[PDB]
């Protein structure tokens, strides 16, 4: 997250921190995700496509810090890693950038709800907020494009949804943005998601309900003028989500 502010996991209780275990035993952060039901975390396919082996992954819930334990955090293995069969990447655009991780602790349990661990609601079909609406993003991604390390403390920011009209302007993304994607940006281009935020949630209040509207997918640089964050449009993937769940 470029700019924004530090947050805590009680403020983002659906946020899932996804890591990968390496031979030798080293563990590195991969991507964010969102808890959509006790046994299921939703994220982005591109985070896993080169290493599609479920055994490799560790998922934390209730965790505020990248390399430390947070009190009440739960650790999970991945019982099922499900990537979208139609995933593909163009020069910038990522298509069908969506993945499901069925989670289970070593004892076989799914998430236990708490102050720091809660599910987030899915939108209804084709039902997204109006463009100009503010939504939040959350993650452990880079604070600046020049960074090569991720911050220790979870971050959030607020960005506005950008219309397809605007996001398909030639100085933005042209026709590389499709109707299965949502663009979101800071009007002054100061805050945005960035590398390492991928797979994490774009959350919008719909009818006083916090709703998973987008999944961090792609963009040209981070917080670049005329280059919004681009998000998998969760409201267009409900059949896919419901089937595999």
């Amino acid at each position: 997250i470029i700019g924004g502010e530090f947050t805590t996991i009680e403020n983002q209780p659906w946020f899932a921190a996804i890591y990968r275990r390496h031979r030798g035993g080293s563990v590195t952060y991969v991507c964010g995700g969102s808890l959509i039901s006790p046994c299921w975390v939703i994220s982005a396919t591109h985070c896993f496509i080169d290493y599609p082996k479920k055994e490799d992954y560790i998922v934390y819930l209730g965790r505020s810090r990248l390399n430390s334990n947070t009190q009440g955090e739960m650790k999970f293995e991945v019982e099922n890693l499900i990537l979208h069969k139609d995933y593909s990447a163009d020069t910038l655009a990522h298509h069908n950038d969506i993945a499901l991780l069925k989670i289970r602790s070593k004892e076989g349990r799914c998430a236990q709800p708490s102050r720091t661990i809660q599910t987030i609601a899915l939108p209804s079909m084709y039902n997204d907020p109006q463009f100009g609406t503010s939504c939040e993003i959350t993650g452990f991604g880079k604070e600046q494009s020049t960074d090569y390390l991720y911050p220790e403390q979870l971050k959030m920011t607020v960005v506005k949804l950008i219309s397809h009209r605007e996001c398909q302007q030639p100085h933005y993304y042209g026709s590389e943005v499709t109707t299965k994607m949502l663009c979101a940006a800071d009007p002054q281009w100061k805050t945005d998601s960035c590398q390492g935020d991928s797979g994490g949630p774009l959350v919008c209040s719909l009818q006083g309900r916090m709703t998973l509207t987008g999944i961090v997918s792609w963009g040209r640089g981070c917080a670049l003028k005329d280059k919004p964050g681009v998000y998998t449009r969760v409201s267009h993937f409900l059949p896919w989500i419901r089937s595999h769940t």
Binding site: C31, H46, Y51, L92, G141, K142, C194, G219, C222, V230
Partner: peptide, 13 residues
């Protein structure tokens, strides 16, 4: 020209 969001946990030669 690659999207930074895209560059997580990827394989390279």
């Amino acid at each position: 020209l690659c999207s930074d969001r895209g560059c997580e946990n990827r394989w390279c030669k």
